[PDB]
Design a protein around this nucleic acid. Structure first.
Ligand SMILES: [Zn+2]
Ligand SMILES: [Zn+2]
Ligand SMILES: [Zn+2]
Ligand SMILES: [Zn+2]
Lengths: 137, 135
RNA sequence: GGGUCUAUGAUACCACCCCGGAG
RNA sequence: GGGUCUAUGAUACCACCCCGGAG
């Protein structure tokens, strides 16, 4: 019966030039999943500005559905609906707003609702950048 | 009598201050297989912070040591300064002839030097055909 | 993201530090 | 040294181009 589901997790891997990858879903409809499950992701489904991709291990929230080939992402964002980070293989020019992740402005000029602090490197809500285990690789 | 050789930097550990040279020429004779020659940062003819980049072209004097072969003085082709590792980038204008920061090519005290590959300092090719830059 | 690295000698695998309504 | 890379959908394995001139 349910066609549209909520999930959360991290990017498992993303091939930047092929424009696709997989998400490791660690929570489905707000329930922890152990073992995690793979959810397919296409670049067209990434909520972010400009060139779309994911960096390995970045924290994500998404809607998904069952497809003929498995589980397919509908819309992928960072925690709280913010923009995804993207791969370090395609660096971008501008600074990112610490509140929404947008390129336009800084957090003091942000018109968006207040967001919790997220790791500047992987967007995880559980740690800050100085203690990032992903950055420490 | 000190020995003369030529080759490339095999590898250089920037923070350990040492590496090895791959000697492909000894006393004007081609060596195949090449032989490793130890190199310490103190023996590099270059200004400021001393290191080598992997694959850069070298000319050197060396001697036999208890541990193997040891560099006495290492330079780029024709006695010019070594390049050094991209891990420690330097700032400032370089002389187009010798690579010094002190002056410009017109004021250079070294004889006129042939064109050397911008990437590895080889006298045998230019940067557009550099096999080292290829990867 | 930002900063400072002029000295680990023998086949290594690349130093240290700072930054969370902040630029 | 300089420039360009906004579209390869299902467990992949990461695109190129220009410059030998001179302070
Ligand atoms: Zn914002
Ligand atoms: Zn993190
Ligand atoms: Zn000169
Ligand atoms: Zn070359």
């Amino acid at each position: 019966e349910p066609q549209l589901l909520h999930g959360a997790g991290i990017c498992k891997w993303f091939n930047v030039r092929m424009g696709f990858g997989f998400l490791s879903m660690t929570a489905r409809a707000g329930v922890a999943l152990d073992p995690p499950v793979d959810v397919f992701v296409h670049q067209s489904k990434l909520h972010m500005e400009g060139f779309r991709s994911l960096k390995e291990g970045e924290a994500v929230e998404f809607t998904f559905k069952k497809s003929a080939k498995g589980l397919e992402s509908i819309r992928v964002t960072g925690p709280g609906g913010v923009f995804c980070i993207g791969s370090e293989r395609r660096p971008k020019g501008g600074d990112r707003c610490y509140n929404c992740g947008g390129l336009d402005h800084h957090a003091k000029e942000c018109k968006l609702p207040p967001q919790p602090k997220k790791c500047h490197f992987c967007q995880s809500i559980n740690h800050m950048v100085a203690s990032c285990p992903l950055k420490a690789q």
